[PDB]
Amino acid sequence: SSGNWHCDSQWLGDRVITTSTRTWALPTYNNHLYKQISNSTSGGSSNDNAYFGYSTPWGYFDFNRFHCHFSPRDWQRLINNNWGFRPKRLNFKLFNIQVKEVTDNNGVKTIANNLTSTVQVFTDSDYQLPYVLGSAHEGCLPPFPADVFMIPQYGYLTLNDGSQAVGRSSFYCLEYFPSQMLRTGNNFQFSYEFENVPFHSSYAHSQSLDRLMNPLIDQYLYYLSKTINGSGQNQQTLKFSVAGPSNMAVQGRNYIPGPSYRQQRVSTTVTQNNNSEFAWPGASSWALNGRNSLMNPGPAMASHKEGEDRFFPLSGSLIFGKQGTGRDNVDADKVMITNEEEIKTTNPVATESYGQVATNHQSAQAQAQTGWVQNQGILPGMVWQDRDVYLQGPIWAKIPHTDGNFHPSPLMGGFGMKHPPPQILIKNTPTQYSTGQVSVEIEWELQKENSKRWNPEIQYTSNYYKSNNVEFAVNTEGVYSEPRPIGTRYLTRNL
Amino acid sequence: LPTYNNHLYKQISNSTSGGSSNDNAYFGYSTPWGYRLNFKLFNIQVKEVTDNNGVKTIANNLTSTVQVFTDSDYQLPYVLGSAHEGCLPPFPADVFMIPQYGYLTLNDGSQAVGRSSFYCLEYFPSQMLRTGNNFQFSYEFENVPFHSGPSYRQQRVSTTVTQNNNSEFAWPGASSWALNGRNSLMNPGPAMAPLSGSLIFGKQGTGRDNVDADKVMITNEEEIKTTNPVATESYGQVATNHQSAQAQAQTGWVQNQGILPGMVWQDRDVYLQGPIWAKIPHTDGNFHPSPLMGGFGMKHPPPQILIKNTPVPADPPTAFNKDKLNSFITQYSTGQVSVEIEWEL
Amino acid sequence: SSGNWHCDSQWLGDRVITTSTRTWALPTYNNHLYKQISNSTSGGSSNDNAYFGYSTPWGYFDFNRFHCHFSPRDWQRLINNNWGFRPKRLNFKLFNIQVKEVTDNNGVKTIANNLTSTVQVFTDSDYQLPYVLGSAHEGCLPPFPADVFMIPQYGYLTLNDGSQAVGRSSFYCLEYFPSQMLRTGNNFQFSYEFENVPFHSSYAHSQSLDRLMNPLIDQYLYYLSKTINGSGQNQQTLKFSVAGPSNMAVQGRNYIPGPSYRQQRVSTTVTQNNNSEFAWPGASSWALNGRNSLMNPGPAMASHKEGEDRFFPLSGSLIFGKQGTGRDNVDADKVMITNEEEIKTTNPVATESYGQVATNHQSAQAQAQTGWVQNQGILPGMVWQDRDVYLQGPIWAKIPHTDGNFHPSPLMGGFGMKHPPPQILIKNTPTQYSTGQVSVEIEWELQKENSKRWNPEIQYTSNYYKSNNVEFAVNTEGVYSEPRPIGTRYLTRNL
Amino acid sequence: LPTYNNHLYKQISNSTSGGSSNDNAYFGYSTPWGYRLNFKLFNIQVKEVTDNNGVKTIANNLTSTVQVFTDSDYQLPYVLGSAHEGCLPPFPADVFMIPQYGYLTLNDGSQAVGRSSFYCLEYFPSQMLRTGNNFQFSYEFENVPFHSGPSYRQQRVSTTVTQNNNSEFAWPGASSWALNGRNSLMNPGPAMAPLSGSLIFGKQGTGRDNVDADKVMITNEEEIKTTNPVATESYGQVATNHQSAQAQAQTGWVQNQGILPGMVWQDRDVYLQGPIWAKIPHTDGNFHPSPLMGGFGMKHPPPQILIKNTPVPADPPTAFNKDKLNSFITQYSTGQVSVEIEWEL
Amino acid sequence: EVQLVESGGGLVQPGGSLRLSCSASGFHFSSYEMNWVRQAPGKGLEWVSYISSSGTYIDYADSVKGRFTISRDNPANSLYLQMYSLRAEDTAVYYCARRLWFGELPYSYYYGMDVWGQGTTVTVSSA
Amino acid sequence: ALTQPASVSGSPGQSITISCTGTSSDIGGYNYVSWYQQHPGKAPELLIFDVSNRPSGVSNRFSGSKSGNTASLTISGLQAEDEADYHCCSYTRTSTVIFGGGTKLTVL
């Protein structure tokens, strides 16, 4: 018993230190082998779907999702009372490694303890492997500590032409890294330091960008108002008015909302949607070297306009699923769809245009032609809210090493980094499996509420409902299920 | 500095002001408060007005008071960046009136949403001043760069009226960005060398409405035309397909462009009637924070200064009554205002 | 100036600092006199309403209601994140005093500064006067800081037989107590330290008083299940059984619920109520020296059984009233009715019987007979919760100075104190009136929320639906309002 | 220490027992854990069970672990004051089964109000013990009185049946206390000189149901009767009216009397069968905290000690499946358990 | 994802009987009230009856009153309206609807009906 | 019950108002009213609850008012979608609800 079980999180000042410990089991993947994987084995029937990679015997740990580290009650304490948070320190333990041997006699099987066997664990602090923690994959430590989970098989991809490789394609043998070996008396740990990141905002603006003005006072700027004196011929004129609170649309402003890349709009009421199949044709994507890519979730934008819930961007928002939800073609009721409603103050609406521009020069004979702006990149003086993290969402991603980027903060939420928490790879040393314990710890620096608001806020609150079974708790069969996606943005600030 | 709203905070909304349309819709509150660097406030003179029968007799008030607080945590809504009227006068001898404070919060239609907030400026600590008391503070700006490309096209408008098309294109042709279902005019817009493109000051004597063109001063930025695209011009062309034997080379116009690596641009220019600073909204990200009406952007700009004439209650009835007191002595006050703004070249 | 304007709250660790500054206007009461007051002038048609006493010219300051010290937000902040609170220090400042003198010739009066007038204001720290603060009267500083209020008029009631006095009655002269005298250059400050008080319980027990048991195990205790074998003569027998999860009614419990005094039951649907004038005859009432008096609110008891919200105990509630409510015969929806149901776990329901007891002794010729226990006072082993405190309710009351008392906590709720915050009396000097400022401060100590509970709490929250006005805010006409009574029991503890 | 619920937290309720009475309805959970003052847990053993065909094989597993923590913060629900079976046995050579832990919470009927709580014991830090590891802690007792009148009348039942009434009056005749509308038999009640007010213990080997009088030990509290009232007799008499020239005096019986200033009473007598301590429900107020079943009531009673077999899975599959692992090696553990209590006389 | 769907019944004889049942899915059914309202084919809505979450208060508008009953099974998330002595005066689309609730503490009431059932047609005809 | 017109018509773009009048037990005394749009063969959808309060799903253009002994729905900016039958609902003195005959809105 080389280590103990640590789970509870303590709140101290401007810091949160949370700890989760999980019981794991590791199988033997690919029959102790590396195996090149391409699509032609799965059939790869399209060119967007082509890939080249290597499925390796190694396993790895992924704690990248929030509910690993926070209980739904301790997610509440965070979101109700705090404007911001961000990770500072990490601590990772792997201990009580216990390797078993499975004996098969006839059809029945007995399993026994294998003492000499070792487990190997190596973590990559030079980042010389392909980093797969950033795709929000399955296989992360379970949300409810009393569950026991199965480590995912490691793998990676690299270049291809069609399904075939190319002269620049790569091959990685994780065996060629130094690693540590552990018997039933050995534990493993290492500590980490997150690199400086911005606080993740967890608040909703108490103002909208277009309303920042004072309602009581005229501007001193003038705007073009009447270009005609009335009905008739050769009536042109130039008239000018004050920008004032009676007409607030035409006023001048210092800043303008975030960028947009439009989405298709899909209604939750099936009879309103078109009878055609727009799931792939309709979706907005981005083409890289002949391969299209669904734009998901996409740039940060509001989910829907005011008073229009029943609509959601087709690929603009994260979609989870309820416990027990099958893998393929599940019903709409089964999945949980998150919405960006809070950011509608500074961010454009996903299913809507950014705005208009003029397409010509007017003259005596030529009317003003305006047209819609579907996608708008960054202009100087834009302000935009990033996407909100959810209890179930990804924490960090790794910023792809490049000459340049803009606002590296990743699209599915959380914190971008050039040196994230390093990958942790593990294997059975070559009918053998192994179990153990994993206690991961993260430390979160907080940003407290300074607001002077007079009236009460909006809080995440459990309803006073009386039902068959309590929410965020196990049902009769012992299944622990999460009923809703919980966003981080409730409290308000001024804009 | 008059006495506003009878010392009341009053909800104001689109409906209260007549509710003309959704784009212009708003919801907010109004206040009795009015609103290197240095600032001083002194020579407090509190003048009670008395109307006996039909004539007005103005007297001093010795005991009566005035309040002030600076907002240095930027907790109240920041209204100083919208280019409102009421700025200090350009001619040093003028006696200027202090404009009222009020703010806009979240609204749906003329209604108020769940997150709509309410601020009681009484809930700030503030310095109370009798006739001989004074007030000052020293502000230190954060460090901004010295004052001296992408495009979002504007319609082209001419000062000769014959050239302009004979139709009402003031709003139909106006560039605008849509935010949560409301069209906001693009004004003045991204800085380019324009219907909404250039700042327009009204001349002295020029009124509120429908004034002619010779009565307003139209700035121009053309000084930037070496590094920037023209306001009304397409940024360029792009290829709209692939060439082949039967496919010609095909081009289409760029009516709007964003940033690219390799672009350079110059900003819009400060003017002597124009703004100095603006506040950078509090947001996870922004690009080129320099405000779009010209001048220097700041994440901790010069703080607001809020001032009211503390109400003096009128005579009350001799038998207790649980209601608030609505009857107050007509009153005002004045004094001097001195400010010092250093500059570096 | 003789003082500055301080309103705000500071949140430091377990401490809350509540700073309020209000502006008052005091007229002259009783034309500078003392006056006998009795029932016979106003008509005195009741022996229960018979009184004798004196109204004095002075005013007094009263901050004894919560909405003075806590903004609606800081109330919400306090309730959601804390398990208890209590006052520590008190700091009170009187400043910027002014005295206006009135001259009215025929129609129009003219009010001018009188600089040499004095204001007489003292604080009685030995509690020598009658102390009227613990009675929940009007005249406390307005919830909203911008509002100006009329300082109440002091007065007191001494003993009487009907309207007539008795020799043991008393007459207190507020002129007899040394009182600092203030001119427009004077400011009066004192401080106060709160005596030891228990933290207010601001949580709802998760488990009831009767479910404390383990559901999975039997008790070793035994109960009497059967007194006869079947149908016929001479079936007398004694059968026993284990107390177990099958029958939990009978399991032996350490603790039992608190006291009860039954209240009559009124429905908020007026057609379920009896067609008679039972408002006075029906209601519970206690009698003293031959004078009947209503029982209001009474011992702290749950308002209604679980699931029955149209019922409220006739006299047993704290019924506040909405902004603008009339004085007399206002409709039932003009008033706000508090409910204590959060205590229903520990405390009996007010409209139900506490239990039954057996009247006779059974024999062959007698059946075991039982009867309803209407009012049951303290028995050893009881546990109960006090009544809640609301944003609109009292803070403290003075414990009457008597031989003895049990559970000094006052029956309208709040913190009972033998030496509460002293009374502060003020007057104009002997047609003239004064106006000035008040800044009162209390320091509150907090009890932090310790819970390990997995699933999220009930929080107080502002409901999410578009409405004409923001709640806890001014209307268009300027009138501040408080939409509903906000108690403090939201978070939860185990029993 | 067997393995409970196959490593699962399970909601249990009234309908999950079949229910059918409202006064009996309940809702709650069940947990895989089992449950001066000095304590030590030493010489742990892990006994794994395989079944080949139908023969069971008990095998030493040296590698496996066992978990324990103590709750000194009373953050978990507390069942130890309810007189449950599963304590350390009376006979010092007996080997006993570690009982299951689970806790009831709020309900209405068999459903759960939003106020019901769910505690995950995996969420405390716990000390994991192998065979060589020992676990030890001490607990200090808070100041408590050395162990040595109001009445709520009980119905009187005779052990000579021909004296008893010829009808079924077990439930209909009993003194109860309704709480939230659920009738609750009053047991054991206040200390008095008792149909539902007497502690009753079973004789060795006694059955569970419908046992007759000879099988159980019915205690009696006659020893404390000198300063206490009779359980079957009314506390006294009172006047019901005013006498007059026309009105004879009248009296009435007192079936129950609350406390009055200057009452003295004795508490319930404790046995070597009965409980030691209880936990006072954390509340605004209580009176005479001494638990009605006897012993020492405390605000911080001795901690709870929770323990379970650390689950070791069976052989997981060869390709990753996100579902949790539901197949586990059969196992149960045993070891040495020593409690040491210092006493005052 | 809030779904009220009622099976109920079709054509039936005068003087006969019918049993309508509803199914609440996606929301906590035990907290809300539930209403039965009916819309005769050419006429506007009429409220037949309502039932409280705990079932303590069951009230009938008096047309039916005495000829129908209303029941709800909270563990089964199902509302029931059983009707006897049908007339032609009862032929309508019957809706399963619930009233506004906001998940707060007791003594809080909201007036309006939040979610509606898609309806079931009931034809009481002699021929 | 509550009396409201048989039908109302308006031209697109302009705001129009439906009213429903009731006795002092239904409306005049109590503040209970609520408004529903319905389309043929669709379950009604709530617009306005209480007097002026409105649910999250419902659009801006729908507001509500009570001038006393009467209640009124003001629709702004008429479109083709706005064509529907609008209903008036108010819990009575005896806490039993009543409706009104429904009013069809015809956008010309």
Judge whether C59 and C29 are in contact, CB under 8 Å.
Answer: yes
Closest residue by Cα to residue A90 from A194, A195, A196: A194
Tokens 């933290």 — which residue? C199
What is the distance between the alpha carbons of residues A53 and A155, in angstroms, rounded to a whole number? 7
CB-count exposure of residue A88 (10 Å: 0-12, 13-18, 19+): middle
With contacts defined as CB-CB under 8 Å, which chain A residues touch E5? none
User: Which residue does chain E place closest to F30, by CA atoms?
Assistant: E111
Q: If you search the block for the tokens 């980027």, which residue do you land on?
A: A405
CB contact under 8 A, E52 and C463: no
Q: Is residue A114 a contact partner of residue A212, using CB atoms and an 8 Å limit? A: no
Distance CA D322, CA C321 (A): 57
The pairing of beta strand D104-105 with beta strand D27-30 = antiparallel
- Examine chains F and D and say if they touch (3+ CB pairs below 8 A): no
Neighbours, chain F (3 or more CB pairs < 8 A): A, B, C, E
Rounded to the nearest angstrom, the minimum Cα separation between D28 and chain A is 10
CA-nearest residue to E75 within chain A is: A468
Q: Is B285's CB within 8 Å of A239's CB?
A: no
- CA–CA distance, D204 with C119 (Å, rounded to integer): 85
Exposure letters B53-67 (e unless 16+ CB within 10 A, then b): eeeeeeeebebbbbb
Q: Residue C457: closest CA among chain A residues belongs to which residue?
A: A462
Owner of token pair 């200033």: D261
Structure tokens of B188? 């003045």
One DSSP character per residue, F29-66 reads S----EEEEE-TTS--EEEEBTTTBB-SSS-TTEEEE-
Residue of A nearest to C465 (CA): A307
CA distance C2 to D20: 73
Nearest-CA distance F61 → chain C (Å) = 12
Closest residue in chain D to residue C494, using alpha carbons only: D77
Of A332, A461, A465, the CB nearest to E31: A465
Residue A76 φ then ψ, to 5° = -70, -50
- Tell me the β-bridge partners of A355: A373, B177
For residue E110, what are the CA distances in angstroms to C212, C357, D319, E32, F57? Answer: 35, 42, 53, 11, 17
Burial of C468 (0-12, 13-18, 19+ CB in 10 A): buried
Answer yes or no: do F50 and E112 touch at CB < 8 A: yes
- Both tokens of residue B29? 């509150």
Number of A–E residue contacts, CB under 8 Å: 29
Relative to beta strand F97-98, strand C319-321 is unpaired
Angle at which helices A72-81 and C72-81 cross, to 10°? 160
CB B142 within 8 A of CB B300: yes
Which residues of chain A make contact with C462, given a CB cutoff of 8 A?
A: 455-458
Q: Are B337 and B43 in contact (CB under 8 A)?
A: no
Helix (H, G, I), strand (E, B), or coil: what is residue F27?
helix
- Alpha-carbon Rg of chain F, whole angstroms? 13
Q: In angstroms, rounded to a whole number, what is the distance separating the alpha carbons of residues A24 and F22?
A: 68
Partner-chain contact D114 E75, CB within 8 Å: no
Site from A240, A449, A453 to mutate, B interface, most B CB atoms within 10 angstroms? A240
CA distance B108 to chain F (A): 7
Residues of D in contact with E75 (CB under 8 A): 15, 110-111
Breaks (C-N over 2.5 A) in chain E follow: none
Q: Do F53 and C333 touch (CB under 8 A)?
A: no
* The two three-digit tokens of residue D329, written as one number: 């090696």
Contact B88, C443 (CB under 8 A): no
Q: Closest Cα partner for A301 from A373, A355, A352, A335?
A: A352
Q: Are A342 and A330 in contact (CB under 8 A)?
A: no
Q: How far apart are CA A406 and CA A424, in angstroms?
A: 29
Cα–Cα nearest to B140, from B345, B306, B344: B344
Burial class (CB in 10 A: 0-12, 13-18, 19+), D77: buried
Beta bridge partners of A26: A434
- Is E75's CB within 8 Å of A466's CB? no
Q: Which residues contact A426 (CB under 8 A, 6 or more apart)?
A: A26, A58, A59, A60, A61, A94, A119, A120, A121, A151
**Residue ranges with strand state E in D102-159:** 104-105, 127-129, 135-139, 151-152
Which residues in chain C have Cβ-Cβ distances shorter than 8 Å to D211?
222, 239-241
Residues A340, A352: Cα–Cα separation, whole Å: 14
Hey, of E31, E114, E115, which one would you mutate to test binding to chain A, going by the most A CBs within 10 A of its CB?
Answer: E31
Residue B223 among known ligand-binding residues: yes
* Least CB–CB distance from D255: residue in C205, C344, C359: C359
Rounded to 5 degrees, φ, ψ at C79 are: -65, -45
Alpha-carbon distance A475 to nearest alpha carbon in chain D (angstroms): 5
Measured at the CA of A378, the angle between CA A374 and CA A380, to 5 degrees, comes to 130
> CB neighbours of D60 closer than 8 A, spacing ≥ 6?
D45, D46, D47, D48
Which three-class secondary structure state does DSSP give residue C441?
strand
* Contact list, C147 vs chain B (CB under 8 Å): 324
Whether the link from the prior residue into A297 is cis, omega within 30° of 0, is yes
Amino acid letter, F101: G
Q: Which residues contact A348 (CB under 8 A, 6 or more apart)?
A: A257, A258, A259, A260, A301, A302, A354, B177, B178, B179
Judged by CB atoms closer than 8 Å, whether chains meet at D282 and C385 is answered as: no
Contacts of A420 (CB under 8 A, 6+ apart): A131, A133, A134, A396, A397, A398
The answer to whether A23 touches A144, Cβ cutoff 8 Å, is no
Strands annotated E in chain D: 10-13, 27-30, 37-52, 55-60, 66-71, 104-105, 127-129, 135-139, 151-152, 200-202, 211-212, 216-218, 236-239, 251-254, 256-257, 277-279, 285-286, 296-298, 304-309, 331-341
Q: Min CA distance, B216 vs chain C (Å)? A: 37
Residue D306 backbone phi and psi in degrees, to 5: -115, 140
Q: Which residues pair with A394 in a beta bridge?
A: A65
Cβ-proximal residues to A329 (8 Å cutoff; 6+ apart), any chain: none
Question: Strand, helix or coil at A296?
Answer: coil
Q: How many CB atoms lie within 10 A of CB C240?
A: 23
Of the candidates B282, B5, B270, B3, which has an alpha carbon nearest to the alpha carbon of residue B148?
B270
Q: What is the number of H-type helices and E-type strands within chain F?
A: 0, 9
Scan for tokens 């493109």, then name that residue: B197
Range list of H helices, A24-155 = 39-42, 72-81
Q: Enter the resolution in angstroms.
A: 3.4
Chains E and B touch (3+ CB pairs under 8 A): no
Q: What angle do CA B304, B305, B310 make, to 5 degrees?
A: 145
Which helix (H) or strand (E) is A287 found in, with range?
A: strand A285-288
Q: Which two tokens stand for residue C324?
A: 């603008």
Residue type, B228: N
Contact: C341, E106; criterion CB under 8 Å: yes
The answer to whether E4 and E22 are in contact (CB under 8 A) is yes
In one letter, which amino acid is B110? S
Q: Which chains touch D (3 or more CB pairs under 8 A)?
A: A, C, E
CB C78 within 8 A of CB C391: no
Residues 22-41 of B with CB under 8 A from F: 22
Q: Is the Cβ of A220 closer than 8 Å to some Cβ of chain E?
A: no
Q: Are strands E78-84 and E17-25 parallel, antiparallel or unpaired?
A: antiparallel
To the nearest whole angstrom, how far is the Cα of D26 from the nearest Cα of chain E? 14
- Which chains lie within 8 Å of chain B at 3 or more CB pairs, if any? A, C, F
Question: In the block, which residue shows the tokens 């409690």?
Answer: D339
Residue of E nearest to A336 (CA): E1
Q: Do A212 and B104 touch (CB under 8 A)?
A: yes
Helix (H) or strand (E) holding B55: strand B55-61
Task: Tell me if B98 sits within 8 A of B307, measured CB to CB.
Answer: yes
Distance CA A412, CA A396 (A): 9
Q: Which two tokens stand for residue A289?
A: 């070297």
- D169 closest CA partner among C240, C244, C228, C252: C228
Question: What phi and psi values does residue A67 have, to the nearest 5 degrees?
Answer: -60, -10
Residue D11's nearest CA partner among D97, D117, D83 is: D117
DSSP-derived secondary structure letter, C69:
H
Q: Does F54 sit within 8 Å of B111, measured CB to CB?
A: yes
C 226-245 → F contacts, CB under 8 A = none
Q: CA B117 → CA A452, A487, B16, distances in Å?
A: 10, 20, 18
Using an 8 Å CB-CB cutoff, list residues of chain A that contact chain C: 8, 71-73, 75-77, 80-81, 451-464, 470-473
List all residues 6 or more positions away from B125 whose beta carbon is below 8 Å from its beta carbon. Answer: B69, C4, C5, C6, C7, C8, C19
Distance from the D260 Cα atom to the nearest Cα atom in chain C, whole angstroms: 9
* CA E79 vs CA B122, D130, E94, E99: distances in Å: 53, 55, 13, 14
Give the torsion through C-alpha atoms of A252, A253, A258, A262, to 10 deg: -10
Beta carbons within 8 Å of A344's beta carbon, 6+ residues apart: A208, A302, A305, A306, B179, B180
For chain B, the farthest-separated pair of C-alpha atoms sits apart, in whole angstroms, at 101
Using alpha carbons only, how large is chain B's radius of gyration in Å?
Answer: 25
* Contact with chain F for residue A308, Cβ under 8 A: yes
**Start-to-end Cα distance in chain C:** 54
Here the tokens at position E98 are: 């619930």
Show the beta-strand stretches assigned E in C151-281: 153-158, 181-182, 188-193, 204-205, 222-228, 236-242, 256-257, 260-261, 265-267
β pairing state of A256-257 and A382-384? parallel
Counting Cα atoms < 13 Å in the Cβ hemisphere of B245 gives 0
Q: Beta strands A311-313 and A355-358: pairing type?
A: unpaired
Q: How were these coordinates obtained?
A: cryo-EM
* C-beta atoms surrounding A189 within 10 Å: 12
